[PDB]
């Protein structure tokens, strides 16, 4: 029988091999709805005659 | 996809002749093969 529950060694003077970092996977998936998330995009300005 | 058109004019059989407005659009994306309705009591 092995134990797999380990403690964190995570402390930021330690060395390379162990650090603490931030993760975040962003899951995208795109159907046959319309998309309710969009992203920003840079405009110009308005032109007449 | 799930359309509403609601149209609200004032007024047992109706007469005349108006043009629905469209209200809510949700893709909720489900079968729906059968429906009933709702009643408020007092």
Same mark, same amino acid.
């Given at each position: 029988? =092995?134990? $797999? +529950?380990?403690?964190?060694?995570?402390?930021?003077? =330690?060395?390379?091999?162990?650090?603490? =970092?931030?993760?975040? *996977?962003?899951?995208?998936? +795109?159907?046959?709805?319309?998309?309710? *998330?969009?992203? $920003? %995009? @840079?405009?110009?300005? +308005? *032109? @007449?005659? | 996809?799930? %359309?509403? =058109?609601? %149209?609200? !004019?004032?007024?047992? &059989?109706?007469?005349?002749?108006?043009? /629905?407005?469209? &209200?809510?659009? /949700?893709?909720?994306?489900?079968?729906?093969?059968?429906?009933? !309705? &709702? +009643?408020? /009591?007092?």
């Amino acid at each position: 029988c =092995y134990f $797999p +529950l380990r403690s964190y060694s995570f402390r930021p003077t =330690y060395g390379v091999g162990h650090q603490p =970092y931030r993760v975040v *996977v962003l899951s995208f998936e +795109l159907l046959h709805a319309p998309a309710t *998330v969009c992203g $920003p %995009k @840079k405009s110009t300005n +308005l *032109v @007449k005659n | 996809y799930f %359309k509403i =058109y609601s %149209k609200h !004019t004032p007024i047992d &059989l109706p007469q005349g002749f108006s043009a /629905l407005e469209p &209200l809510v659009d /949700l893709p909720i994306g489900i079968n729906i093969t059968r429906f009933q !309705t &709702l +009643l408020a /009591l007092h």
